[PDB]
Amino acid sequence: KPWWEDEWEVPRETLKLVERLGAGQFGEVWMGYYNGHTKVAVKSLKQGSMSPDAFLAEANLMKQLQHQRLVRLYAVVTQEPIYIITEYMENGSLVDFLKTPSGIKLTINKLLDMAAQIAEGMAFIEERNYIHRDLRAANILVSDTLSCKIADFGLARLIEDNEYTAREGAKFPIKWTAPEAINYGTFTIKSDVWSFGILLTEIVTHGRIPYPGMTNPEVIQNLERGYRMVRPDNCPEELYQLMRLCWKERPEDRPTFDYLRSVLEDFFTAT
Ligand SMILES: c1ccc(-c2oc3nccc(NCCN4CCNCC4)c3c2-c2ccccc2)cc1
């Protein structure tokens, strides 16, 4: 809809940017307030750093993916500098949170709880015929109540047919991406499942980089041999085997996110 008819467009005057949470090549993300009292996250686009349409495309997709387990779109300011305002998560990125004094003290029980919460969010994405493609601990946000939500939908895509094919030149984080995606540029929800497996290792190691001591070439070589990531230190064996399911050779053999959610919830209610 046109901005003068769009429910999400808001006057820039309604926003007060208070603290910067991140600065980058394409813009910044600040902590701020909407209409004085409501805490929000404000992603601002650096003019000329990238297409405004590309930037706003994520907001448009977020309009279609509303759920308690996904960071919620709040509003947009479509006049430069362009803003996308969303729900604020008091404890930042999961990869960062797990390294703080609080994160470090979390029990395996709570880590599994968080894992299930993430799988729950992905299960929604799965059912709505969407894919995320950038599933990793850095893209999971944590609330003041230690609940987790899926973030960054820049690479997310509505899957009209079973799979999405990227651009031959497109590059992705080798360690978190499924083989078929790395080799063919083909992404499916099953590609996200593989990524979830890697994310689980990030959780249990409190933010450690996957495949410790290995370069990307080494990871690919080993994977092709049928090897998978070595059991992380102090990783419960049941969780490790759940990870293995996510890393099955055939995408179709990997479990659904609803299955993963169900199992992780059992793991949690057991501990
Ligand atoms: C300390 C520090 C940050 C936050 C924090 O609160 C947030 N609320 C909503 C969306 C957010 N971010 C949306 C965009 N992120 C998604 C994850 N990748 C980086 C960009 C953040 C972030 C944030 C911003 C940049 C990088 C990482 C987290 C709270 C406390």
DSSP 128-164: TTEE-S--SGGGEEE-TTS-EEE---TT-EE-SSS-E
Let me know if 161 is a catalytic residue. no
Residue 227 main-chain phi, psi, to 5 deg: -75, 160
Q: Which superfamily is assigned to 1-88 in CATH?
A: Phosphorylase Kinase; domain 1 (3.30.200.20)
SS3 21: strand
Nearest to 198 by CA among 237, 246, 126: 246
Sequence ranges of the domains in the chain: 1-88, 89-270
Asked if 73 contacts 156 with a C-beta cutoff of 8 angstroms, the reply is no
Which amino acids are annotated as binding site for ATP, given as ranges?
21-29, 43
- For residue 138, CA distances in Å to 4, 141, 169, 209, 237 come to 35, 8, 24, 11, 24
Asked if 87 contacts 221 with a C-beta cutoff of 8 angstroms, the reply is no
- Return d(Cα 66, Cα 36) in angstroms, integer: 24
- For residue 50, CA distances in Å to 60, 74, 105 come to 17, 22, 40
Burial, 107: exposed, middle or buried (Cβ in 10 Å; 0-12, 13-18, 19+)? exposed
Please check whether the two domains, 1-88 and 89-270, share a CATH topology: no
Question: How much distance in Å is there from the Cα of 221 to the middle of ligand 1?
Answer: 34
Residues with CB under 6 A from ligand 1: 21-22, 29, 41, 71, 86, 88-89, 92-93, 138-139, 141, 151-152
Residue pointed to by tokens 């299955």: 259
Asked if 263 contacts 128 with a C-beta cutoff of 8 angstroms, the reply is no
CB 169: neighbour CB atoms within 10 A? Answer: 6
Q: What is the CATH number of domain 89-270?
A: 1.10.510.10
H/E run at residue 75:
strand 73-77
The per-residue b/e assignment along 174-198, b for 16 or more CB within 10 angstroms, e otherwise, is ebbbbebbbeebbbbbbbbbbbbbb
Ligand 1, atom 26, lies closest to the CA of 22
- Return d(Cα 254, Cα 46) in angstroms, integer: 39
Q: Would you state the structure tokens that stand for residue 1, as one six-digit string?
A: 């809809």
Does residue 81 have a cis peptide bond before it, meaning omega lies within 30 degrees of 0?
yes
Pocket residue to mutate for ligand 1, from 93, 98, 132, 202, most atoms within 8 A of Cβ: 93
- For residue 251, CA distances in Å to 118, 138, 144, 189, 240 come to 20, 24, 36, 9, 18
Method: X-ray
Q: Would you state the structure tokens that stand for residue 79, as one six-digit string?
A: 């006049």
- For residue 118, CA distances in Å to 11, 15, 186 come to 33, 30, 23
- Outline where the chain has alpha helix (H): 52-64, 94-97, 101-105, 108-127, 179-184, 189-204, 216-225, 237-246, 257-270
Asked if 244 contacts 227 with a C-beta cutoff of 8 angstroms, the reply is no
- Cβ neighbours of residue 116 closer than 8 Å, sequence gap 6 or more: 260, 261, 264, 265, 267, 268
Position in ligand 1 atom list of the atom nearest CA 22: 25
Amino acid identity at 104: I
Ligand 1, atom 29, lies closest to the CA of 92
| Residue in 6, 113, 134, 253 annotated catalytic | 134
- Return d(Cα 17, Cα 39) in angstroms, integer: 10
The 3 state secondary structure assigned to 25-62 is CCEEEEEEEECCCEEEEEEEECECCECHHHHHHHHHHH
